[PDB]
Write a protein that binds this ligand. Structure first.
Ligand SMILES: *[C@@H]1O[C@H](CO[C@H]2O[C@@H](C)[C@@H](O)[C@@H](O)[C@@H]2O)[C@@H](O[C@@H]2O[C@H](CO)[C@@H](O)[C@H](O)[C@H]2NC(C)=O)[C@H](O)[C@H]1NC(C)=O
Ligand SMILES: *[C@@H]1O[C@H](CO[C@H]2O[C@@H](C)[C@@H](O)[C@@H](O)[C@@H]2O)[C@@H](O[C@@H]2O[C@H](CO)[C@@H](O)[C@H](O)[C@H]2NC(C)=O)[C@H](O)[C@H]1NC(C)=O
Ligand SMILES: *[C@@H]1O[C@H](CO[C@H]2O[C@@H](C)[C@@H](O)[C@@H](O)[C@@H]2O)[C@@H](O[C@@H]2O[C@H](CO)[C@@H](O)[C@H](O)[C@H]2NC(C)=O)[C@H](O)[C@H]1NC(C)=O
Ligand SMILES: *[C@@H]1O[C@H](CO[C@H]2O[C@@H](C)[C@@H](O)[C@@H](O)[C@@H]2O)[C@@H](O[C@@H]2O[C@H](CO)[C@@H](O)[C@H](O)[C@H]2NC(C)=O)[C@H](O)[C@H]1NC(C)=O
Ligand SMILES: *[C@@H]1O[C@H](CO[C@H]2O[C@@H](C)[C@@H](O)[C@@H](O)[C@@H]2O)[C@@H](O)[C@H](O)[C@H]1NC(C)=O
Ligand SMILES: *[C@@H]1O[C@H](CO[C@H]2O[C@@H](C)[C@@H](O)[C@@H](O)[C@@H]2O)[C@@H](O)[C@H](O)[C@H]1NC(C)=O
Ligand SMILES: *[C@@H]1O[C@H](CO)[C@@H](O)[C@H](O)[C@H]1NC(C)=O
Ligand SMILES: *[C@@H]1O[C@H](CO)[C@@H](O)[C@H](O)[C@H]1NC(C)=O
Ligand SMILES: *[C@@H]1O[C@H](CO)[C@@H](O)[C@H](O)[C@H]1NC(C)=O
Ligand SMILES: *[C@@H]1O[C@H](CO)[C@@H](O)[C@H](O)[C@H]1NC(C)=O
Ligand SMILES: *[C@@H]1O[C@H](CO)[C@@H](O)[C@H](O)[C@H]1NC(C)=O
Ligand SMILES: *[C@@H]1O[C@H](CO)[C@@H](O)[C@H](O)[C@H]1NC(C)=O
Ligand SMILES: [Cl-]
Ligand SMILES: [Cl-]
Ligand SMILES: [Cl-]
Ligand SMILES: [Cl-]
Ligand SMILES: [Cl-]
Ligand SMILES: [Cl-]
Ligand SMILES: [Cl-]
Ligand SMILES: [Cl-]
Ligand code: NA
Lengths: 526, 526
């Protein structure tokens, strides 16, 4: 029986057998006051003693959020949907620790993605018992509020100041600072890791003065705050808060009255109107996201990055080979998970409209000009491939490269990976390739479990990735030093070296997407 | 009607329509006295005026040589067999010139491979009318003697001094020096290019003081003199000359009598006994090859290379992804062009015996240790792939890399390519991959001919390669400057950058086969 005394009370955990060993999991520990009633849309408030043995033996509620009902019954999409009840009372975190209890273990804190509109820490692909077992690190993960409830912003107004879900993540990081030594953890060796919006969140904790001392290093998988979906302008946020108000009959003349009104709405009426706060959306819409609130984020983060105002530490950054494909089946014409999606030039052009709402005509021709000079015009999957690359390069890959470039110019070691392995079990079709989100199960070690029907080459790839992530967290260097592995070079402006992750053998290459990102990065920002 | 006056007489050529343009081909011009009778096994003797209009309107005889009868009826092998009559009277060359006649065109001189035992300039994949048409270079190619008739060596004895076939190539290069201005060529801009044994020959003309002033630059495709098959020791040559003598009842006590006796044998009795001058051969045997004769080759060429004694100029060097596969079907157990050749560990070991005759047991275990640590032992094509890589890395790839490394250390620009495109028309099976010999048709431009059933991506690849080879020859720099192409970096010890050639897009990479060649290059030379 395992009871740990925390600053706020005792917690009981549960033992887990993993790979003939034991991990202790403390699932669903609370880290803030439930943000209900009068606390809705406010910054999370600190938690007071229970006393009391809190039983942390199951995952807690996930935060309220719309769910993906596009493919009912389909594992590829439904695997991302919440797997605990939804509730505004969702501010909990999970701790997994090796057994026997470590002495001063390095801590890995996971921040989930989901567009800032969705996600939960209890997903199966985020289960941190493999990492704790195999690498003897402690893994922590937290639920933070998403959608309007986590990011609604009425700028400067503490009733809805914005970034609440980023302040939830932050209060979780404090909880680790204050409490993790009790579980056997080293609060001085804490690495944040996150994917997509979770990565973008990691990148903003790098810029946030209040997070500076809550962690040591950072890992960004498929995301960074400079991605075009990751920060809402003050203009847009205002328009959106008011549009939500209007749609819920909460329009007022006094803004504090708007918020008061919205605090009376049911979680569901808020969720139902989120999608419409915007005249046209895309499959990549982030209606309620991070904003420059003067608190968490003191200035437009592009200025902070350019001028070197951020936590000085090592970063590990990466992307997958086919980032953009996943999104094309949520609204691009001619695209289906259920056929090979060979689309036409005219369809490609219609797709640009779906993904680039407006976007001058000249803007959209320019994408077309850049991506459709074939070599050569023979290949029927030409336009289908091009639309996926457009969406991935713009939304994920070039913004990750440009973040890494700018961060490293201030003197810190940065490591960049290009993940190019398609899981043998991917439920999505072949044409979608190495999709967004599908490195995650490799990082968390799921392929280490033989009972699971991954290939042997995949077990070995995962084992290597886990070692590299763990050495990065413990030592700031993502090497696998024992098995004559390719040495991972730092990424510098100038050479821009990166490491490819695949089952055959990993290469050092240079200047990923050079020609493409010159387009997105220099020209497109029409 | 096109008549050119040469130092030795007039020659008439013939007009050819190529790609809606015209090339003039002068096929089968003689360049030495026929080396018959008393001239057999001797250095080629210069040619005296005919006078006389020599009609150069068809390919000449190929030199005597054994033929590959392993796959009668099969295009994959028979495409390499001679396509003109065999005859000791085979010392002719071919010239292709653009029309209209150029003013001072760069010259490309092709030296064929065939293990020094076979080959001919009249093969269809060596037809230089596409190059002349498309790049307005002049292409020259020569037949030189092969087998015992070209390389028999009784060291120091001018009746059989060795390297005769290398002196045939050399006298052809002089002929270009003396005569090519008459066809519109610049004798000051001459590039040699060659594949396999033809490349090895190019690399020895780089070391040969008598070739120094007969050319400007060099291209080596899949071969270099330091390959383990490319130079015969004086010991071996002596043993082999005597074994041949013995086998033809030509043994004598006086060595000049041996040669005199052999000069009385019929071409055929010599050819028939070549294969046996050696106790055990391999599919890569070179029974009669270059030797250190004190004339063409003044010292063991490994010493010349190490100590920087060679023509100081630019080189272009490359290899194909699957060099070693072609050879495995000529005697490795379990291998067939007619099935997927999945062999077993025990078969793999038997293969090493075929390819490494002797070769201590420890020598052969060491190859096995280096090439059979799988990742992982699951894959059934494991051993089949490993044997091909063993044979390619040892015989072609590492010796080409080590040549390039050592040549470049003395201060010259060198460019290295890794050719990784499998021809859409390859007649050999899929498991054999990107085979030895199959870049050649791309270099000569055959895919530029649409009537020919190559894909569009292959036309474009070939067009690019032709431009790069031509710019190398004309300007010492293998760039394709017009179509936003990847820039080809020089190869330096230290970074060892190389360019990949494939239909999708070409990459700059580093340290090809690093771990493998450390084995062949440092350790194996057991
Ligand atoms: C700020 O909002 C308006 C959209 O007004 C919205 O009303 C909301 C309650 C919601 O239902 C939403 O769907 C609706 O559009 C944006 O201007 C809109 O542009 C289109 C173009 O025809 C009009 O049809 C909309 O009605 C029009 N607004 C109106 C009704 O006046 C505006 O773009 C947006 N500003 C942004 C994009 O930041
Ligand atoms: C691949 O499928 C897409 C997706 O739309 C279809 O899904 C299919 C599996 C099928 O059940 C079909 O009924 C369903 O609508 C096809 O795109 C569609 O093309 C059809 C053919 O006319 C149009 O009617 C639809 O407007 C269009 N769907 C939309 C709204 O995007 C696509 O044609 C198909 N392409 C192939 C097989 O290459
Ligand atoms: C030099 O040659 C001998 C081989 O003697 C050869 O006689 C030739 C005419 C030819 O027919 C050839 O096939 C025959 O071998 C090499 O030594 C040989 O090694 C084997 C081992 O058992 C014996 O069976 C051979 O007969 C033996 N030579 C003899 C007959 O005395 C020798 O290796 C070779 N030297 C090299 C390799 O350079
Ligand atoms: C692939 O074929 C090889 C090559 O040998 C065979 O060629 C086949 C296409 C067939 O016509 C066969 O008759 C011919 O001998 C096979 O290797 C052979 O394996 C057979 C099976 O017993 C042996 O009897 C032979 O000794 C051996 N051939 C030699 C001398 O190398 C091989 O087994 C086959 N493998 C497959 C299908 O994976
Ligand atoms: C635990 O170690 C503390 C220092 O941690 C450093 O060492 C590594 C863990 C590294 O990753 C860095 O994060 C840190 O700088 C030390 O001060 C504590 O006293 C230790 N606590 C124990 C053992 O109780
Ligand atoms: C032909 O050019 C001669 C010099 O050739 C140089 O220029 C390039 C062709 C280059 O590749 C180098 O090989 C040479 O250094 C010049 O001396 C001759 O006079 C020219 N002959 C003519 C035009 O009749
Ligand atoms: C809390 O849960 C544990 C584990 O299931 C159980 O053994 C324990 O009795 C519980 N305590 C109470 C009564 O909350
Ligand atoms: C807006 O209304 C709120 C309701 O409490 C009040 O506190 C605030 O002072 C008002 N301000 C004005 C005058 O707009
Ligand atoms: C190293 O390789 C061994 C087997 O040779 C494997 O079992 C082990 O898990 C590997 N270690 C890492 C961290 O990759
Ligand atoms: C040489 O061959 C040409 C081309 O076929 C022919 O026209 C010419 O008359 C020939 N001259 C002689 C008689 O050798
Ligand atoms: C070897 O025989 C040849 C035959 O002409 C002769 O020239 C040479 O002098 C002889 N040398 C001796 C004595 O071995
Ligand atoms: C350049 O590309 C064009 C078409 O854009 C092609 O027709 C031409 O042959 C190319 N030139 C070379 C040398 O590759
Ligand atoms: Cl899963
Ligand atoms: Cl158009
Ligand atoms: Cl094409
Ligand atoms: Cl790229
Ligand atoms: Cl052919
Ligand atoms: Cl064994
Ligand atoms: Cl395997
Ligand atoms: Cl390699
Ligand atoms: Na432009």
């Amino acid at each position: 029986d395992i009871i740990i005394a925390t600053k706020n009370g005792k917690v009981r955990g549960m033992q887990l057998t993993v790979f003939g060993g034991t991990v202790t999991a403390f699932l669903g520990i609370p880290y803030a006051q439930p943000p209900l009633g009068r606390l809705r849309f406010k910054k999370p408030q600190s938690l007071t003693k229970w006393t009391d043995i809190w039983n942390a033996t199951k995952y807690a509620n996930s935060c309220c959020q719309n769910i993906d009902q596009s493919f009912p019954g389909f594992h590829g999409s439904e695997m991302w949907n919440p797997n605990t009840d939804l509730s505004e009372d969702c501010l909990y975190l999970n701790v997994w620790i090796p057994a026997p209890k470590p002495k001063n273990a390095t801590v890995l804190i996971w921040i989930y993605g989901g567009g800032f509109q969705t996600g939960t820490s209890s997903l199966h692909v985020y289960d941190g018992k493999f990492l704790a077992r195999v690498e003897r690190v402690i893994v922590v993960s937290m639920n933070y509020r998403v959608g309007a409830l986590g990011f609604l912003a009425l700028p400067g107004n503490p009733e809805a100041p914005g970034n609440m879900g980023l302040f939830d993540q932050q209060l979780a990081l404090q909880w680790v600072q204050k409490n993790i030594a009790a579980f056997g953890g080293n609060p001085k060796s804490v690495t944040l890791f996150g994917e997509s919006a979770g990565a973008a969140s990691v990148s903003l904790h790098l810029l946030s003065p209040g997070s500076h001392s809550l962690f040591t290093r950072a890992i960004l998988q498929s995301g960074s705050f400079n991605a075009p979906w990751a920060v809402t302008s003050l203009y847009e946020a205002r328009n959106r808060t008011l549009n939500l108000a209007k749609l819920t009959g909460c329009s007022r003349e006094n803004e504090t009255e708007i918020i008061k009104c919205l605090r009376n709405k049911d979680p569901q009426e808020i969720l139902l109107n989120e999608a419409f706060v915007v005249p046209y959306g895309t499959p990549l819409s982030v209606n309620f996201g991070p904003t420059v609130d003067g608190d968490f984020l003191t200035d437009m983060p592009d200025i902070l990055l350019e001028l070197g105002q951020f936590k000085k530490t090592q970063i590990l950054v990466g992307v997958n080979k086919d980032e953009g494909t996943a999104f094309l089946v949520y609204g691009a014409p001619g695209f289906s998970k259920d056929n090979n999606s060979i689309i036409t030039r005219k369809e490609f052009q219609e797709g640009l409209k779906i993904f680039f709402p407006g976007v001058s005509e000249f803007g959209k021709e320019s994408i077309l000009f850049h991506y459709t000079d074939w070599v050569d015009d023979q290949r029927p999957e030409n336009y289908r491939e091009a639309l996926g690359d457009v969406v991935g390069d713009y939304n994920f890959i070039c913004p990750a490269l440009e973040f890494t470039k700018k961060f490293s110019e201030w003197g810190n070691n940065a490591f960049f990976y290009y993940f190019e392995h398609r899981s043998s079990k991917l439920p999505w079709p072949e044409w979608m390739g190495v999709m967004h989100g599908y490195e995650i199960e490799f990082v968390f070690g799921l392929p280490l479990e033989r009972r699971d029907q991954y290939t042997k080459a995949e077990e070995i790839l995962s084992r290597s990735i886990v070692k590299r992530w763990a050495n990065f967290a413990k030592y700031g260097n993502p090497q696998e030093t024992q098995n004559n592995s390719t040495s991972w070079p730092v990424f510098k402006s100038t050479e821009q070296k990166y490491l490819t992750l695949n089952t055959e053998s990993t290469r050092i290459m240079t200047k990923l997407r050079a020609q493409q990102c010159r387009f997105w990065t220099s020209f497109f920002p029409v």
